[PDB]
Write a protein that binds this ligand. Structure first.
Ligand SMILES: C[n+]1cn([C@@H]2O[C@H](COP(=O)(O)OP(=O)(O)O)[C@@H](O)[C@H]2O)c2nc(N)[nH]c(=O)c21
Ligand SMILES: Nc1ncnc2c1ncn2[C@@H]1O[C@H](CSCC[C@H](N)C(=O)O)[C@@H](O)[C@H]1O
Length: 291
């Protein structure tokens, strides 16, 4: 058994203290172990991000614009969580595909079946006005050409929607498939527990202060680094059993998840953080129908 004692997990890409030469063979390895892992990955991360906003005093009263939301089965639990805490939020979910019916009939969530373009973003910006916006984008077209095009759109989202915070889907293209150096918004590289076994994807979380917009170039040397750190994490780290982690599940991912969950806010008071986390995990697993 691959055991170990860890103090804390790698919460952000910058914390990963080791790299590995990427082994193409890993592509053939089982990508997921849990049912609805996708909605799990999505929800913990989106819960983490939003709790922050709440912590910063910027969530309440905001309109959450989620682009690339369908099915968005998990979004429903998210919506209830803040709604039950008493935070006022309006959700505007947009996708060309259809949303999980559990999203319907809630007055505070508006579904839209529209593939957004730069033009559309301008009208939704005029119609949202003057509400403060929090943007969440998880749009997907894949080729580096596809990727760049997506990253380009996310950038036009922020420039037109002019949000107070954002969470963007972030996966660097692969160095052996580089096309050109491009810019992404400055934000924290949030590591996603329960992401596919060899996923190099994370979530870019940014808070927009002032009227400024800080970007950052991404070059192939960067793409090489992203590849090596993400492969070491996936291969080595994530397959770690945190034997000093006293929990129903000591596997890394749950250890990593405990850490994002211990930051989430609840109504019920617990004697310990073990209790709140066991509680929110159980709650979310039950919601997702995950054993
Ligand atoms: N990780 C995955 N791939 C390739 O990506 C393909 C799709 O797997 P994926 O990267 O998990 O898809 P996604 O990121 O779009 O969700 C695999 O078949 C591999 O060929 C990768 N290819 C390179 N060069 N480097 C990596 O770090 C890497
Ligand atoms: N311009 C566009 N506008 C909106 N959604 C888009 C888009 N281009 C791709 N997408 C959508 O992005 C989605 C990628 S999957 C997104 C999953 C969703 N966040 C969840 O909770 O399950 C797809 O449904 C796709 O239709």
């Amino acid at each position: 058994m691959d055991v170990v004692s860890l103090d804390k997990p790698f919460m952000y890409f910058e914390e990963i203290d080791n790299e590995l030469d990427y082994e193409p063979e890993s592509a053939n390895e089982v990508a997921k172990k849990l049912p609805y892992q996708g909605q799990l990955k999505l929800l913990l991360g989106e819960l983490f991000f939003l709790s922050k906003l709440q912590r910063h005093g910027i969530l309440d009263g905001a309109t959450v614009v989620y682009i690339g939301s369908a099915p968005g089965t998990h979004i429903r639990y998210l919506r209830d969580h803040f709604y039950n805490l008493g935070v006022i939020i309006k959700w505007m979910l947009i996708d060309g595909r259809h949303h999980d019916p559990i999203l319907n009939g809630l007055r505070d969530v508006t579904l839209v079946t529209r593939f957004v373009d730069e033009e559309y973003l301008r009208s939704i910006k005029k119609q949202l006005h003057p509400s403060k916006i929090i943007l969440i984008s998880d749009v997907r077209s894949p080729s580096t050409a596809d990727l760049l095009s997506n990253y380009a759109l996310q950038n036009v989202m922020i420039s037109i929607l002019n949000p107070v915070a954002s969470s963007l889907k972030w996966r660097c293209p692969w160095p052996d498939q580089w096309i050109k150096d491009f810019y992404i918004p400055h934000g924290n590289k949030m590591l996603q527990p329960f992401a596919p076994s060899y996923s190099a994807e994370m979530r870019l979380l940014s808070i927009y202060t002032g009227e400024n917009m800080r970007l950052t170039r991404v070059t192939k040397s960067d793409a090489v680094n992203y590849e090596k750190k993400m492969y070491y994490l996936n291969k080595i780290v994530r397959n770690k059993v945190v034997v000093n982690f006293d929990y129903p599940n000591q596997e890394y991912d749950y250890f990593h998840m405990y850490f994002m969950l211990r930051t989430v806010y609840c109504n019920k008071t617990f004697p310990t953080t073990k209790a709140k986390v066991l509680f929110l995990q159980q709650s979310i697993f039950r919601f997702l129908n995950i054993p």
